[PDB]
Amino acid sequence: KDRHSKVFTSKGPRDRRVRLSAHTAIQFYDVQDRLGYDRPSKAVDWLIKKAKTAIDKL
Amino acid sequence: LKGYSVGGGEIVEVQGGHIIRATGRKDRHSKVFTSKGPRDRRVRLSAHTAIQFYDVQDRLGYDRPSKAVDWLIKKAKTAIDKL
DNA sequence: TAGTGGGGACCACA
DNA sequence: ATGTGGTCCCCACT
Numbered sequence: 708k709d710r711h712s713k714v715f716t717s718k719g720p721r722d723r724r725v726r727l728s729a730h731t732a733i734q735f736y737d738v739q740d741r742l743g744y745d746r747p748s749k750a751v752d753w754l755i756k757k758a759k760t761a762i763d764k765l
Numbered sequence: 766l767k768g769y770s771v772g773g774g775e776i777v778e779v780q781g782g783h784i785i786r787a788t789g790r791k792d793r794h795s796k797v798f799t800s801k802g803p804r805d806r807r808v809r810l811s812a813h814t815a816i817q818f819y820d821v822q823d824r825l826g827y828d829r830p831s832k833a834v835d836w837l838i839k840k841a842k843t844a845i846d847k848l
Numbered sequence: 849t850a851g852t853g854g855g856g857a858c859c860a861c862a
Numbered sequence: 863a864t865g866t867g868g869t870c871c872c873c874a875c876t
Contacts, residue, residue, distance in 0.1 A: 709857055710864055714812050716819040723815040724807055724868090725830040726853055729797055732806040733782035734838050736799040741848055746867075747808035751837070755817050758840035765824040786851095791871060793851055807854085809867055829853075 771803060 713720040727735055739750035755762070770776055774785040776798060783798040796803050810818055822833035838845070 709855095710866090711809075712812055712865070714815045714819065716816070717823045718819075721815065721819055722855075723812060724809045724854080725818075725834070726807045727834055728831045728852095729779060729784050729795055729806065730781065731831045731834050731838075732797045732804070733779070733784075733799070735834055736797065736801075736804055738838065738841075738845055740800040741845070748811045748814045748867085751808075751810060751818055751834070752814050754834075754837040754841050755814075755821065757844040758821075758837050761840040762821055762824070765821070790849085793849090794853095795851070805869065807869080809869095811866090831853090 774803070 711723065713722055735747070735750065738754065739747055742750055742753060744750050744753075768776060770785075774788045774796065777784050777786060777795075785796040785798055785803050787793045787795060794806065796805055798804075818830070818833065821837065822830055825833055825836060827833050827836070
């Protein structure tokens with residue numbers, strides 16, 4: 708049995724993994740590698756930080 | 766740039782990059798080639814990151830998380846272009 | 849029948 | 863003791 712935590716979301720508990728489409732993954736990993744991060748999670752942290760102005764308009 | 770494979774799945778050119786066909790049939794997902802070599806298209810977000818990311822996905826109204834990553838990359842284009 | 853998204857499990861580790 | 867990152871199979875669907 709797996710012991711990975713899920714997170715609370717507006718639609719219920721959610722697994723912490725995401726599958727990226729091929730084109731999205733290629734662009735995402737370009738960002739991650741240009742940032743020098745070993746863990747993808749740190750790259751989406753950075754994307755969320757840099758997209759904050761747009762996110763707040765949602 | 767050149768090579769049929771890393772040495773390995775068949776390397777297939779796509780728009781903006783290259784994908785790698787599955788090397789077997791029990792799992793037929795393609796991988797992608799990146800500056801650090803072949804990579805899986807699936808990533809695990811830390812709990813803190815996942816919560817924020819799904820909030821963005823849910824506020825966008827998107828069914829698939831990959832589309833929310835697309836949106837984030839677009840909205841970050843300014844910061845990305847400066848490295 | 850070739851590639852998909854996403855569930856469950858597992859390795860190695862703390 | 864209860865998580866971790868990352869990935870291996872697998873199921874349903876195309």
